[PDB]
Design a protein around this ligand. Structure first.
Ligand SMILES: NC(=[NH2+])c1cc2c(I)cccc2s1
Lengths: 8, 245
């Protein structure tokens, strides 16, 4: 959806 | 990467592949990088140093293979190329080996979030994991120092962080390693980063987040006993990153 740093 | 396993970008959705175009028709791989925010990718200066003509580089995100497309990939042009002032190379190390690439799509946009494209987190001011932590490196570099080609499939491997005391021992790298670098190796010197892996990330979990702790920079040989891989210590460059992003 939107960037969430470090999420695979 | 020497050893390691083959993977897909789903597993490293912030890895960026940087290529260079040639007046002739071919595009060749240069180095890896990581997506920090929608428009910025961070890599290493030594990758651009010899040919700092931003117009000839192409950046691809969401890429699991080297010269064949992946569905979901995005192609960008380098709008800005920031190399480090104070970058130095000696007979082994690279100092202040960090660079920033602002990317622009042919449509004027930066990266979009997908199942194959994600940003990696930055650490807080001089905050690193402790030696012993297992971190993972990813890239398309050589699988054997003797090879003269790169793999077509993305690879990853896990390495552990070692202290500066260990890395600066005379039979390791002595004072060629500074406080702005970090060293990581496999206990049994079986896996490591290598040529073609420059610029890509050393990711570790810090305070609960997958953090970019280092950038592949140099090493003597690949997977050589008492020759750990050295990386740029991101946590020490935060001010520099900030002043530009
Ligand atoms: N042993 C290593 N981790 C590395 C070795 C090299 C070499 I040889 C060239 C460029 C980058 C790297 S990283």
């Amino acid at each position: 959806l939107k960037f969430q740093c470090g999420q695979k | 990467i020497i050893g390691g396993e083959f993977t897909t970008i789903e597993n490293q959705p912030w890895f960026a592949a940087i290529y260079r175009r040639h007046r002739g028709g071919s595009v060749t791989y240069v180095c890896g990088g990581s997506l920090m925010s929608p428009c910025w990718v961070i890599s290493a200066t030594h990758c651009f140093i010899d040919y700092p003509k931003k117009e000839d580089y192409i950046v691809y995100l969401g890429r699991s293979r080297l010269n064949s497309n992946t569905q979901g990939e995005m192609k960008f042009e380098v709008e800005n190329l920031i190399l480090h002032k104070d970058y130095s190379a000696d007979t082994l190390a690279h100092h202040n080996d960090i660079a920033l690439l602002k990317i622009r799509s042919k449509e004027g946009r930066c990266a979009q979030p997908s199942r194959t494209i994600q940003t990696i987190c930055l650490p807080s001011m001089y905050n690193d994991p402790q030696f012993g932590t297992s971190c993972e490196i990813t890239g398309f570099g050589k699988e054997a120092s003797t090879d003269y080609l790169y793999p077509e499939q993305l690879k990853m491997t896990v390495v552990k962080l070692i202290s500066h005391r260990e890395c600066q021992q005379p039979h390791y790298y002595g004072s060629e390693v500074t406080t702005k670098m970090l060293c990581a190796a496999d206990p049994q010197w079986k896996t490591d980063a290598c040529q073609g892996d420059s610029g890509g990330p050393l990711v570790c979990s810090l305070q609960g987040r997958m953090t970019l702790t280092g950038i592949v920079s140099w090493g003597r040989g690949c997977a050589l006993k008492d020759k750990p891989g050295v990386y740029t210590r991101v946590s020490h460059f935060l001010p520099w990153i900030r002043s530009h992003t």
